[PDB]
Structures are given as structure tokens and as C-alpha cells.
């Protein structure tokens, strides 16, 4: 019994005990409110408790006591209890979901051996994230992305089947439009780019870590991505569209005319830029695999086959019109040109002739 109870034991220095009392009272308040039926007063006091326990500054110094106290499991059970149900049950009590998601993201960002442990909940977070989008704010997808940030181990170690779940969710978002934007002031445009950009960002965080992409995860996501043509935009898949230049100029023309707070052309170009950037990181890295092993040759041949050359040159040739002296931040944007310049120096490179243009 002493052997089993010793992991719970912790020793703290003097002159810091008052803040530990504040932490214990806050955690006792959460523990007592765990059994109470959910309500607006309960969510208000719980939001206040989480906000007060974030600013304690004992969270800054010691994460081992936070890990031994099992606070993360308690907040996770809170999120399970509130989130569980239908989609309208997920939008029921819409607040305080962001508070728990932000708390778990910050706890993951605190230090290692915490991100190892949040990692275990990846699958449950993933299938809760799909219905759990709702309004703008912290989402379980952000927590799942924060579990894999900047870790060579963890990613590449245990990512067996979750990528298939993400690409299947992306394919499901590729067909049909979401009703929540269609209800208020929308042209009923199918295949909404708002649903899918977060999945592409999570995939980008998965494939690229600490400056070099991981080959195995890149190959797996390449295969499950190419197995379904609907995940890519209907310009790439359908013969009605033509590459990215027609789609980009279509987005510009939609942005030019009030009809045919989100700008649809900006969202379209953000989705396409995110897809291009994800394909850019997913290319073989540093060309040292490519010198002797043909798997990188086949992968680079496929990713050359999806995107034709001179389309990116046409994209960078398209002018944004600089207001200078500016204007709206939701237009053509000088922040996605680097995305198109990322798939050029990884799957195309520069010889000498194209350097002129």
C-alpha cells in the first residue's frame, strides 16, 4: 500500500503554500461541481475556476504535481459530459468548451511528459472534433495538433490509423455544403472551404516536424489522399475546372462582386494555399533519399503529376494590386505566395532558364 501510495506523494518548498491552498480550493470546487447537473451558473463558476487556476503561477513551475493530481483527466471528463450527444447537443452550452480546450492546449504546451499523456486521447478527440467545430474558438482539433507539435517521437511512433480518419473526414467535407453558413447570407456554394482547412492544418502539423518531414507518415497520407479524388478541389478532379489559375481568378472575381463575416474567395484561396503547402512539405526532403532509392522518385513523380508546372508561375504572375499608403485583410493576401513558392523548391526546383521569369 505504501508502494502504491508513493506516486501520489509530493513535496513542496515553503513560502509558496498559500498559492497551493488556492489551487487546492479551486480543484475541490471543480471536483464538487463534477457531480452537479449542468447549468449556466455551474458553467459560469467553472469558467471562473479554470481562469483563476490558470493564473495561479504554480502551473508555471511544477507540472509534475499537476500530473499527479489528475487535473487533466478531470477536465477531460467535464468535456466528455458536456460534449456528449448530438450536434445540437454539442452546440448546447456552446461556451466553456473553448475554455477546456484552451486549458488542455496550454497544458500540452507546458512541457514534455504531459504531451505524451494528452496524446493517449487522440482518437476520441478526433471523432469529437468533427461535430465539435461550432463557432470560432478553441477546438479539440487544436488540442490534437498540440499533442504532436515539435516531437519527432510521438509522431511517427503511434499514428497507425488516425490519418485515415482525418482524410475520410476531409472527403466527407469535400462533398456537400454545411448548413450553418447557408442559412445566413450565402450563395449556397457547395464544398465549403471553411470545413477542411483545419483538417489540412492538422495533416500539415503531422507530416512536417522540427524542419524535416517524416517519410513514412508522408507516404501513408499520400496514399490515402490520392485514393479519393474528391478530397482535392473540383478544379483538380473535375474537367470543368483548370488547375489553380482558373480557380484563383474565379475567387478574385467573386471577391470583386458583392454577390457571386467571411469572404468566400479568401476562404477558397486559403483552402487551395493550405493544400499546396501541405503537398509542399510532403515532398521528399533534402534529395538524399532521391539520390539512391526510387521510392522518393515515385513519390515526386506522383506529386509532379497532380500539379502541372507553369501554374505556380502563373499564380505568382497574377497581381494583387497593393493599396499601400492599406485596405481589407481578407482579399488576395501577400501571405499565400510563400505557399506557392514552397511547392516549387521541393518538387520542381530551379535550373537556370526559369530563373529569368
Amino acid at each position: 500500500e505504501l508502494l502504491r501510495a508513493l506516486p501520489r506523494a509530493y513535496t513542496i518548498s515553503p513560502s509558496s503554500v498559500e498559492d497551493t491552498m488556492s489551487l487546492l480550493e479551486c480543484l475541490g470546487q471543480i471536483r464538487s461541481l463534477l457531480i452537479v447537473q449542468m447549468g449556466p451558473q455551474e458553467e459560469n463558476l467553472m469558467i471562473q475556476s479554470i481562469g483563476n487556476i490558470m493564473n495561479n503561477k504554480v502551473f508555471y513551475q511544477h507540472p509534475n504535481l499537476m500530473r499527479a493530481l489528475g487535473m487533466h483527466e478531470t477536465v477531460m471528463e467535464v468535456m466528455v459530459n458536456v460534449l456528449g450527444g448530438g450536434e445540437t447537443k454539442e452546440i448546447r452550452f456552446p461556451k466553456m468548451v473553448t475554455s477546456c480546450c484552451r486549458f488542455l492546449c496550454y497544458f500540452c504546451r507546458i512541457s514534455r511528459q504531459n504531451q505524451r499523456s494528452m496524446f493517449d486521447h487522440l482518437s476520441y478527440l478526433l471523432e469529437n472534433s468533427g461535430i465539435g467545430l461550432g463557432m470560432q474558438g478553441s477546438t479539440p482539433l487544436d488540442v490534437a495538433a498540440a499533442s504532436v507539435i515539435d516531437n519527432n517521437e510521438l509522431a511517427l511512433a503511434l499514428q497507425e490509423q488516425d490519418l485515415e480518419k482525418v482524410v475520410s473526414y476531409l472527403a466527407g467535407c469535400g462533398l456537400q455544403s454545411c448548413p450553418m453558413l447557408l442559412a445566413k447570407g450565402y450563395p449556397d456554394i457547395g464544398w465549403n472551404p471553411c470545413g477542411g482547412e483545419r483538417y489540412l492544418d492538422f495533416l500539415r502539423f503531422a507530416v512536417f516536424v522540427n524542419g524535416e518531414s517524416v517519410e513514412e507518415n508522408a507516404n501513408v497520407v499520400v496514399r490515402l489522399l490520392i485514393r479519393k479524388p474528391e478530397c482535392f478541389g473540383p478544379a483538380l478532379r473535375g474537367e470543368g475546372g483548370s488547375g489553380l489559375l482558373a480557380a484563383i481568378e474565379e475567387a478574385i472575381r467573386i471577391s470583386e462582386d458583392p454577390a457571386r463575416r467571411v469572404h468566400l474567395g479568401h476562404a477558397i484561396m486559403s483552402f487551395y494555399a493550405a493544400l499546396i503547402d501541405l503537398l509542399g512539405r510532403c515532398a521528399p526532403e533534402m534529395h538524399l533519399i532521391q539520390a539512391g532509392k526510387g521510392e522518393a522518385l515515385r513519390i515526386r513523380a506522383i506529386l509532379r503529376s497532380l500539379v502541372p508546372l507553369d501554374d505556380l508561375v502563373g499564380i505568382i504572375s497574377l497581381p494583387l494590386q497593393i493599396p499601400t499608403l492599406x485596405x481589407x485583410x481578407x482579399x488576395x493576401x501577400x501571405x499565400x505566395x510563400x505557399x506557392x513558392x514552397x511547392x516549387x523548391x521541393x518538387x520542381x526546383x530551379x535550373x537556370x532558364x526559369x530563373x529569368x521569369x
Binding site: I35, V36, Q37, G39
Partner: protein, 387 residues
Amino acid sequence: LVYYEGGAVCTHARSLWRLEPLRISWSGSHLRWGQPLRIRHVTTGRYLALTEDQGLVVVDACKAHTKATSFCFRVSKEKLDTAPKRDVEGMGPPEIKYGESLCFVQHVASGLWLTYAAPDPKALRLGVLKKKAILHQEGHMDDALFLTRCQQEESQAARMIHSTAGLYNQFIKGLDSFSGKPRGSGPPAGPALPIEAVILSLQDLIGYFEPPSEELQHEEKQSKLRSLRNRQSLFQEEGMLSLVLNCIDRLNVYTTAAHFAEYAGEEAAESWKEIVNLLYELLASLIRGNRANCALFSTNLDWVVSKLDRLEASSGILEVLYCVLIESPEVLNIIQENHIKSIISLLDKHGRNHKVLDVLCSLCVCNGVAVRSNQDLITENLLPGRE
């Protein structure tokens, strides 16, 4: 119309088939390949038939002739020798063996096989597969009709279900016969009402679902609980639960039924109270012990609360309300405020009773959670006036 379904339907009593041979004598003989036999669905009371326009449809026994209704069982589709008919008195060798039959339908009059249509529509793909069975000449290769019988006492219950459904249906028709016409001296209605059969069926059905005794051992108690739960589940799925409420409403509309049950005339004033009490007792016996049956009462909370009738059946509706409150916590979210007022007014009209206090206690702190709204509503309804 028959369909091809897979899922929860296997446990339910919708999938039942009985083979009736043409020969009455030695009907229980070993099944021979190629011999004519008719397929019956006991709960619906209908026989499979080809007809002309509709295809494989179930039809009544009176309209069913013998050429379309007759089916057989052939191992191979290719036409064998034309002399399978032979009268045997003993059981004989078992031609059909269970677990490895892999037999085919082969309607005998048309000589045209009825495997399945296999439409495969773009429409309704997300949805559970469901194919209408109609005839194909060439047919398919993956029919795989292997025989695995397992009726057991479950089959017994199915027959009773059919019987009681018919009786109750006819009874309701009698209600729908006479409710409109204000009665005078003389015969109210021609076909009359089958009162005693209804009372006897109600008593037998109440006795069929008796809770197991506490004095029995643990293993036997668990076994009886599981068997009762399965029987109640199938009885709910076949649709008796709505049938009970349909019977209750038409009697409940008549209120005092002193001169109001004289709209039926005599023979109904002596049996009204007994019939409504037995129907409430049967309903309370059916709902108790199953979480799904209690959770399905979410829409009927207003139906069970709003009655509170003075004379007919007191404490019978209260038992159903108590069971709904104790078993299913989903009801407690939709309790509202006027229902608490109604339950409290029941205490003042019907006097002090510990069952209403137990109901109010069960309104709060169901399972581990405690609902604060019901607590404060009961507290504000329990006024400082000490009455």
C-alpha cells in the same frame, strides 16, 4: 411486401416462417427435397403468394389459392427427374440436414426462381440495405439460404402476440363502431362487444409478466430477469404498447360512465372499471424493468400526467409515473413546472399519501447527478404556508 433486412430484425419477431405441408396426415415428417410446402408468417397471419402484378406478397388465407401459395425446396436449380412425389408413413431418411442445407426457393407453378431483385440504387446508400424480393430467371449465385432454426418458447410468444393483436383490434373497432351514435332504447350495435375474452386475456397477460420472486437463488433470479426482459423487449417491438394506450383512450373519454356507458347500453357499466384497471395494470407490468421502454415514454409524459382522474383507476397511473421516474433519467429533464403543481395538487385533493412523497423524492437526485431545477421548484411550491 417482403424485404431483405439485416440487423436488429433477427432478434425481433418480424422474421418468422412456418412450413405447412399439403398433406394433413404425417405433417411432421422429415422434409424431402422438392416437396410442396406453404410459408406462413404467424404474427401477420398471411401466406406468401406470387399473384400476377405484385410478385412475392403476403396475402390472406381466404384469397390464397394453392398454385401460387405452394413452394418447395430444391438443392439444385437444374431440373431433376419429375417423380419426387411419394407417400411415406414413417419419418424416413432426413433429406434436408440443418446447418448445411443451402437450399433454393423454386416456386412450383411458374417454375421461376425468386432469389432477390438486387436493385442497387444510387439513392439510399447511407441507409441500411433493403431489397424487395422478386423473381429472376437466371437468378444469382450468392443467395446462400442455409437453414438454422431456433424458434423455442420465443415462437410460442409470437402466436399469442398475433392472437391478442387481433382481439384488441376487433375490440377497438367495436369502440369505433358505437362512439358516434347517441344510444336510445333498444339494441345499440349489432356485432356487440367481446368483454369476457378481453378481461381473460388481460388477466393472462398480467400474469405472464410477473416479476420474479425475491426468495429464489441469485442464478435463477438472473435467468428469469433476462427471460422476462427479452419477452418484454419483443412484446414492445411488435407494438402492443401503443395498442394498450389506444384501448385506454376510447374508454377514458367516457368519464363517469353511469349514463355515459349507457351509450353502449348494458353489459358495459359493470365491466368498465375492471377493464380500465386491468389495462393500467398490464401497462404498468409491461413498462417496468426495461430502460428502453421507459425512455420511449418521453413524449407521453404529458399523457400520463394530465389524466389524474377521480374515480376510475387511482394509484394505477401513479405506479406508471413512479416507474417512469425511477427507471429513466431522460424524463426528468422535461418535467417542467406545471407537472409539479399537478402532483402537489394530487396530495391536497386525494389526501396524505406516502407514494406522492416518494414520487416527489424520485423527482430529484436520480442516479448520481442531482437536478437543481426540480429541487428549487419543489421548494418554491412547498410554500412557507404550513397547510
